[PDB]
mmCIF file of N, CA, C and O in Angstrom:
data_model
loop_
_atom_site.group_PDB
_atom_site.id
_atom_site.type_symbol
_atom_site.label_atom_id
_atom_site.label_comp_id
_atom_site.label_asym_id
_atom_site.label_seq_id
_atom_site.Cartn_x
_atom_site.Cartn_y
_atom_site.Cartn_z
ATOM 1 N N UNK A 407 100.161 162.805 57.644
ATOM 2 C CA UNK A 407 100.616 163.648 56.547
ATOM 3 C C UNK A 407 100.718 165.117 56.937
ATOM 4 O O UNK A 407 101.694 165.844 56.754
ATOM 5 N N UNK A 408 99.528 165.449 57.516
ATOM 6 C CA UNK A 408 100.408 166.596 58.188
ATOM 7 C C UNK A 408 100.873 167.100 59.144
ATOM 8 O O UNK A 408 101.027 166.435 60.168
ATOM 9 N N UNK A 409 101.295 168.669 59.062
ATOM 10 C CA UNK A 409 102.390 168.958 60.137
ATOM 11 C C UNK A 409 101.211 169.265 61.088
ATOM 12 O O UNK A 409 100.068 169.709 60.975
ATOM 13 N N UNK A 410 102.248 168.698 62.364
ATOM 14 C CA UNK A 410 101.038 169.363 63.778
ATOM 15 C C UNK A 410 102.175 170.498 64.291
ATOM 16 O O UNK A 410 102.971 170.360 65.219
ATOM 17 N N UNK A 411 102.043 171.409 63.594
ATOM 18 C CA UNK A 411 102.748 172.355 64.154
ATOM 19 C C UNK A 411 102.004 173.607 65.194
ATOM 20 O O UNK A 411 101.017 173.252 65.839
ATOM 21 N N UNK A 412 102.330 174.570 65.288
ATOM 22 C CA UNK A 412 101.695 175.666 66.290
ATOM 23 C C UNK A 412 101.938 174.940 67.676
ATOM 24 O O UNK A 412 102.739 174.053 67.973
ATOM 25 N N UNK A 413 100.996 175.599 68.416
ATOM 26 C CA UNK A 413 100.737 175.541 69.920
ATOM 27 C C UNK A 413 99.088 175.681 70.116
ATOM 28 O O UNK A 413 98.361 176.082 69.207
ATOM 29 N N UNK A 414 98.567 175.266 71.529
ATOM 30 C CA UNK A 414 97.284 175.461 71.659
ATOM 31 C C UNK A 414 97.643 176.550 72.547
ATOM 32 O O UNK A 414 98.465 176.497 73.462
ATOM 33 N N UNK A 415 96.630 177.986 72.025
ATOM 34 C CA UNK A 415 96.729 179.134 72.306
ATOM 35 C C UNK A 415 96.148 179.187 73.411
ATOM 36 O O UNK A 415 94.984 179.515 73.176
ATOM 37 N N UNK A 416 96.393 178.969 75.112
ATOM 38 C CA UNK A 416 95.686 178.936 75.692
ATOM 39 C C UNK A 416 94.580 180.085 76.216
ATOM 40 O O UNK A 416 94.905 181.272 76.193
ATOM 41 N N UNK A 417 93.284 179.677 76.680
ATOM 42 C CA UNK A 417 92.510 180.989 77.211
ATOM 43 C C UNK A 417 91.911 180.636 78.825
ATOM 44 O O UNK A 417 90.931 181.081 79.422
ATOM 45 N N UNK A 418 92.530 180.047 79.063
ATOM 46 C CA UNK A 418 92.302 179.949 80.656
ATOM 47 C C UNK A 418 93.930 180.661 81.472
ATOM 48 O O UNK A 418 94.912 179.928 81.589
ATOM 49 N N UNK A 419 93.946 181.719 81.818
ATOM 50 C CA UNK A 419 94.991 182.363 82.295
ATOM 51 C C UNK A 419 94.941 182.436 83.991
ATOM 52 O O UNK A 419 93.954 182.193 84.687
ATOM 53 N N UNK A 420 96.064 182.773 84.376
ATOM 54 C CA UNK A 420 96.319 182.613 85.770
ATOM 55 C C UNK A 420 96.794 184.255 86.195
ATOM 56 O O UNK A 420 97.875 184.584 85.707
ATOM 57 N N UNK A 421 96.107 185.290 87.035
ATOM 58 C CA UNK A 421 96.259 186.153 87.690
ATOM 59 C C UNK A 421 97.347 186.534 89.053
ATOM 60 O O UNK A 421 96.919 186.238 90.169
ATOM 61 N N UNK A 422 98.180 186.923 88.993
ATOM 62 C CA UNK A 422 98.379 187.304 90.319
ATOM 63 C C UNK A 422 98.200 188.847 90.591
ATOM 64 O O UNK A 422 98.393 189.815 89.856
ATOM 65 N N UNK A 423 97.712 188.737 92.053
ATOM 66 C CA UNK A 423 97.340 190.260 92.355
ATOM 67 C C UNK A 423 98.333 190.660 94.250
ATOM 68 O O UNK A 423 99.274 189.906 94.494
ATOM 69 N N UNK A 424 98.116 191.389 94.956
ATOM 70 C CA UNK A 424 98.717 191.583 95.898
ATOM 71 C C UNK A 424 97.164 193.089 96.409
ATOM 72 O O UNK A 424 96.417 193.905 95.869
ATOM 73 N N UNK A 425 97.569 192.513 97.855
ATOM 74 C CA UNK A 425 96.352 193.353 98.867
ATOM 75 C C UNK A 425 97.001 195.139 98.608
ATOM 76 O O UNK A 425 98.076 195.346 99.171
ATOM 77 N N UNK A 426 96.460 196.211 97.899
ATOM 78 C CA UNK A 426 96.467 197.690 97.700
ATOM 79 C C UNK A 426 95.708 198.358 97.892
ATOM 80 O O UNK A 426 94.972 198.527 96.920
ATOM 81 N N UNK A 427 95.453 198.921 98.777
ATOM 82 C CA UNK A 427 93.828 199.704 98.931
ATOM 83 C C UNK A 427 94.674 201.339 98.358
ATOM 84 O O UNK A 427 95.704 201.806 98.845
ATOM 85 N N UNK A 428 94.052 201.788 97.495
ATOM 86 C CA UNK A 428 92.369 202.038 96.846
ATOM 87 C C UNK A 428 92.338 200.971 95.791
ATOM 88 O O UNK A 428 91.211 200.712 95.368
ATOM 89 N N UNK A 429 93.567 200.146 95.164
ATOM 90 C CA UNK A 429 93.905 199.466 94.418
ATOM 91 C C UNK A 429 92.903 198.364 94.226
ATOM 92 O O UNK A 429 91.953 198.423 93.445
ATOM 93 N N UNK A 430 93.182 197.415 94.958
ATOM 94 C CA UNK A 430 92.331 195.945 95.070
ATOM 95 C C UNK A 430 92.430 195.806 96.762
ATOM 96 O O UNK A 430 93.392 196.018 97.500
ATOM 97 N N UNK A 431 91.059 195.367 97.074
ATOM 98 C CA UNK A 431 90.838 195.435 98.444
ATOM 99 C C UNK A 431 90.689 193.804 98.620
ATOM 100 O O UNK A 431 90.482 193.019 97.694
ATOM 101 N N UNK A 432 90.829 193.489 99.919
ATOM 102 C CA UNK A 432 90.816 192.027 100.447
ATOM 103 C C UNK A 432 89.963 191.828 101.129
ATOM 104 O O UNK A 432 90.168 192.290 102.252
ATOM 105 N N UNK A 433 88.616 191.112 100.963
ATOM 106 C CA UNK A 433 88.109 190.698 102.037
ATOM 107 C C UNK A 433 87.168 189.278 102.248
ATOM 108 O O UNK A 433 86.669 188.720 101.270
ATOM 109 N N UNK A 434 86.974 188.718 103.764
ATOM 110 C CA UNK A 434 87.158 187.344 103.614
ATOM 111 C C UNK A 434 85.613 187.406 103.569
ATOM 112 O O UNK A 434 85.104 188.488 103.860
ATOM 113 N N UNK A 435 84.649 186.166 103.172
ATOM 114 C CA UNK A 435 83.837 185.864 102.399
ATOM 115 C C UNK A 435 82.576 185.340 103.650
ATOM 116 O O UNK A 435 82.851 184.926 104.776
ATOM 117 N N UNK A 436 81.597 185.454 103.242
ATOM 118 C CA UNK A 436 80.608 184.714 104.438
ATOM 119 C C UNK A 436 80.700 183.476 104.471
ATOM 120 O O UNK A 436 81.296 182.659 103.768
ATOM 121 N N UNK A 437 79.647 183.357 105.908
ATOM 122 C CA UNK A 437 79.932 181.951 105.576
ATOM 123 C C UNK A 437 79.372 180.633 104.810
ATOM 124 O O UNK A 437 79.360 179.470 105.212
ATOM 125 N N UNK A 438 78.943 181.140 103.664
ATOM 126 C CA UNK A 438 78.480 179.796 102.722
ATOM 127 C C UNK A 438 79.206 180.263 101.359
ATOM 128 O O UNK A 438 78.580 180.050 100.321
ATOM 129 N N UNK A 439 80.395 180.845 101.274
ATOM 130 C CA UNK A 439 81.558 181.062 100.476
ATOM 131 C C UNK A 439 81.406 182.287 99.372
ATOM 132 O O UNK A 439 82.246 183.184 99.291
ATOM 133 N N UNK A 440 80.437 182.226 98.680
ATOM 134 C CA UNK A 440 79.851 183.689 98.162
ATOM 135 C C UNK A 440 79.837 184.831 99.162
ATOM 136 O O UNK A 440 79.215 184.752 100.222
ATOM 137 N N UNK A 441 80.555 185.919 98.787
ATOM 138 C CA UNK A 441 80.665 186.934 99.458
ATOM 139 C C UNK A 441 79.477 187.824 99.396
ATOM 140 O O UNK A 441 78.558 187.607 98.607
ATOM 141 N N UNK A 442 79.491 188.980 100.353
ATOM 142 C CA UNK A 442 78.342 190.052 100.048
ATOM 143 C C UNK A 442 78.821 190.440 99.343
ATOM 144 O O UNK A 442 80.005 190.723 99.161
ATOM 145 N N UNK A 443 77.497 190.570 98.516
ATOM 146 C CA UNK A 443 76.796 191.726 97.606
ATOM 147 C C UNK A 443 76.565 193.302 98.012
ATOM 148 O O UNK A 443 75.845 193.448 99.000
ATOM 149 N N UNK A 444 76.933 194.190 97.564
ATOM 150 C CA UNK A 444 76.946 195.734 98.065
ATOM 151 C C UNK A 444 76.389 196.122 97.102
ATOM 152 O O UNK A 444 76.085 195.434 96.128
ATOM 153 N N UNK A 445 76.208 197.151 97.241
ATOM 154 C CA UNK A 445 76.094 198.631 96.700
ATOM 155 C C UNK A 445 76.899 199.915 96.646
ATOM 156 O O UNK A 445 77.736 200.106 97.528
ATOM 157 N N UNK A 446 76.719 200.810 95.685
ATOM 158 C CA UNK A 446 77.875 201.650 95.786
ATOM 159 C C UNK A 446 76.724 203.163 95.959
ATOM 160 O O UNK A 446 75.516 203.228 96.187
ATOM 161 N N UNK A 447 77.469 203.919 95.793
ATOM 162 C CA UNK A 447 76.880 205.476 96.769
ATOM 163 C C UNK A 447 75.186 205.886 95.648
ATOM 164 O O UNK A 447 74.235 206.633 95.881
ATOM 165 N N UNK A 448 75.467 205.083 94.606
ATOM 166 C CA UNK A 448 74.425 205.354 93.111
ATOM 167 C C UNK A 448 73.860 204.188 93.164
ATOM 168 O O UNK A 448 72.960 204.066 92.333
ATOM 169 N N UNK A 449 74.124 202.879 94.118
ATOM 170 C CA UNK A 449 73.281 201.799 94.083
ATOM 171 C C UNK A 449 73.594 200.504 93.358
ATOM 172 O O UNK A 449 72.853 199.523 93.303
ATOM 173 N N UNK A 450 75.116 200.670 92.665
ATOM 174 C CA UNK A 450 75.182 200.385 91.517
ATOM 175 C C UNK A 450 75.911 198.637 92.261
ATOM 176 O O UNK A 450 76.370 198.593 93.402
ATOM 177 N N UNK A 451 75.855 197.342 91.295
ATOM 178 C CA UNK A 451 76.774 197.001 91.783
ATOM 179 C C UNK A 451 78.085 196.258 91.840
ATOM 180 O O UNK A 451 78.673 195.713 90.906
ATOM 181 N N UNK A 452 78.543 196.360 93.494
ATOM 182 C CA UNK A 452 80.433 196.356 93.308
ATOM 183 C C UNK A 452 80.596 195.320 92.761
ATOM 184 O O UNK A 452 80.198 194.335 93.383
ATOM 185 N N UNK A 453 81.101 195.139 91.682
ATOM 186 C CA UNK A 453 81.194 194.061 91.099
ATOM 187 C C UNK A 453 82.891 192.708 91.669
ATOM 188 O O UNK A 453 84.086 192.790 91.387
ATOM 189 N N UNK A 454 82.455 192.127 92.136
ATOM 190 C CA UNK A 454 83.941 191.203 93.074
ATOM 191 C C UNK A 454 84.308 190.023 92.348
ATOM 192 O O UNK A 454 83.589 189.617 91.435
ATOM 193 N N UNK A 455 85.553 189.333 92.734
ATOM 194 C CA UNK A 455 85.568 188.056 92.073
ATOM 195 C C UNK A 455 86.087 187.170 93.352
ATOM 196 O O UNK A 455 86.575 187.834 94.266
ATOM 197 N N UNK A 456 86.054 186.224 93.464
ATOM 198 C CA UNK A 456 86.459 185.151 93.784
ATOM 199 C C UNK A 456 88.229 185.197 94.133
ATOM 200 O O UNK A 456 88.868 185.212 93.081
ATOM 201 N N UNK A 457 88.953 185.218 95.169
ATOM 202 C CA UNK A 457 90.282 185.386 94.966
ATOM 203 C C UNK A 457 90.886 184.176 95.551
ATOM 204 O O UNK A 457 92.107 184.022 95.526
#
């Protein structure tokens, strides 16, 4: 009886980015796949994702 109208609004989205330094930096990962962890000049930290 009723309408199945709309769409499912999705929230899993797909990124593309490209290598820009000061922009977004590239770098490859250690070796058990989690990258280092840093610090920044205040200690703070660099926060990275997964690319």
């Amino acid at each position: 009886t009723e309408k199945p109208r709309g769409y499912q609004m999705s929230t899993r989205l797909k990124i593309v980015t490209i290598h820009q330094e000061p922009f977004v930096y590239v770098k490859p990962t250690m070796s058990d796949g989690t990258c280092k962890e840093e610090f920044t000049v205040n200690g703070d930290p660099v926060k990275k994702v997964i690319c």
